[PDB]
Amino acid sequence: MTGELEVKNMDMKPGSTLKITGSIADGTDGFVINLGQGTDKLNLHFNPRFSESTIVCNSLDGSNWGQEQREDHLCFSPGSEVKFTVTFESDKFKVKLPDGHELTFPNRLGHSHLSYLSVRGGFNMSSFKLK
């Protein structure tokens, strides 16, 4: 649990961007960036799964995961330094990947401000920047 950062009481409004930098642990099979209203309200569950050569995006509403959206464009690796830019719009999230490729994921949970960010797995978040 050490290093699995949790950020609370953010005030990310629609139209804002979150820039995240971190290091991916050598030999890790995947990691998670969660962004939402709270621990059981995740608008964006962003889960690169190196082990499955895919990025899994989903929402979490209470105890119920939504329908997964899988993106096969997993072109960064264990050991990589990576930067991501997440854009929160009322209707959708845009995630800009390290190579400039952008994924889009619908916002399923309304446009209340996002207050919660957490990391799980083999990702050491070294910086974040809210704009």
Ligand X SMILES: OC[C@H]1O[C@@H](O[C@H]2[C@H](O)[C@@H](O)[C@@H](O)O[C@@H]2CO)[C@H](O)[C@@H](O)[C@H]1O
Total number of residues that touch a copy of itself (CB under 8 A): 22
CB 124 within 8 A of CB 23: yes
109 sits near ligand X (criterion: CB under 6 A): no
Min CB(121)–a copy of itself separation in Å:
13
Residue closer to a copy of itself by CB (options 46, 123) is 123
| Span of 43-51, 56-64, 103-111, 119-127 interacting with a copy of itself by CB under 8 A | 119-127
Q: Which of 23, 37, 54, 58 binds ligand X (CB under 6 A)?
A: 58
68 sits near ligand X (criterion: CB under 6 A): yes
Give bridge partners of residue 22 from the DSSP assignment: 82, 125
- Of 74, 72, 73, 62, nearest to 24 by C-alpha is 74
What HEC string does 17-63 produce? EEEEEEEECCCCCCEEEEEECECCEEEEEEEEEHHHCEEEEEEEECC
6 sits near a copy of itself (criterion: CB under 8 A): yes
CB 32 within 8 A of CB 21: no
Task: Check the annotation: does 70 bind a ligand.
Answer: yes
Q: What angle do CA 13, 16, 22 make, to 5 degrees?
A: 115
Binding residues for a beta-D-galactoside: 65-71
| Binding stretches for a copy of itself (CB under 8 A) | 1-11, 21, 113, 115, 124-131
Binding residues: 65-71
